[PDB]
Design a protein around this nucleic acid. Structure first.
Lengths: 105, 105
RNA sequence: AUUGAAGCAAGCUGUCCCUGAUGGUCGUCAUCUACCUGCCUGGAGUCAUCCGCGGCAUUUAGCCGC
């Protein structure tokens, strides 16, 4: 078993590459909101990683860009269905969104 | 003694549950309800199957609660110990000596 | 193959003495060199009380330390 006075969780989002996809600013803001959503949900109730790994979050902060502010989870919850609707209306998604395939040898 | 032996009634029922575990989606809830029907403490303290026939022993459940005791600012004291001979009057003879000083804390 | 010897082409001649070493020069020149992406997606996990039954006892005649 290990004892550490400073455990850190690092998160990195590659904005340059998603811009290099160039599918549209609606897709860019969708993917940014989706990533922030994932991070917030993991941070709130994902921290029982292992049976003896009982962890808690003391504080989140941004590192780069300096001085930015992170949305709250309820705000992302409220925004997400609108941004997904917009991207669906732009027709980027295939239809039907969920597609079914059957598996056998 | 349990889930093995010449006679075992509560192998059939578990095999009936593992039939669903194998022939469909694996579900921790079905395991939890089976354990609730056979042993309420198994639900709280967890189980792991190991018989090849029971889906390779893939099914498992971690403990639902845990506890322990710990100390701080401990002052060192000292003690000894004993773990030594276990000899025999006839037949297999291997042990004739032994000791454990340890200088244990 | 045997009683009265194939167990039988059996006795038949090749010896010791000799010194092979003195000296030769394998040696000079030679440019190996330049260009290239390895990388890429993938949970190892889960529950299982260090206590001590040693010594004294050949011992269920019976107890006792760290």
């Amino acid at each position: 078993e290990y004892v550490s006075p400073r455990i850190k969780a690092y998160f990195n989002l590659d904005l340059a590459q998603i811009r290099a996809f160039g599918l549209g600013e609606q897709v860019d803001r969708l993917l940014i909101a989706l990533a922030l959503y994932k991070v917030r949900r993991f941070l709130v109730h994902g921290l029982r990683l292992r049976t003896a790994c009982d962890l808690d979050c003391q504080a989140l902060r941004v590192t780069r860009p300096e001085g930015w502010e992170v949305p709250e989870l309820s705000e992302l919850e409220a925004a997400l269905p609108g941004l997904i609707e917009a991207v669906a209306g732009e027709g980027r998604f295939a239809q039907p969104a969920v597609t079914i395939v059957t598996y056998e040898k | 003694y349990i889930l093995e032996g010449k006679d075992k009634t509560l192998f059939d029922l578990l095999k009936q549950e593992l039939a669903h575990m194998e022939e469909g989606p694996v579900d921790i809830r079905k395991l939890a309800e089976t354990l609730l029907k056979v042993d309420a403490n198994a639900v709280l303290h967890g189980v792991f199957l190991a018989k090849k026939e029971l889906a390779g022993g893939r099914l498992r459940l971690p403990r639902a609660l845990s506890a322990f005791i710990e100390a701080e600012d401990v002052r060192v004291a000292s003690s000894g110990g004993v773990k030594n001979d276990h000899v025999n009057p006839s037949g297999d003879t291997s042990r004739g000596f032994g000791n454990v000083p340890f200088a244990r804390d």
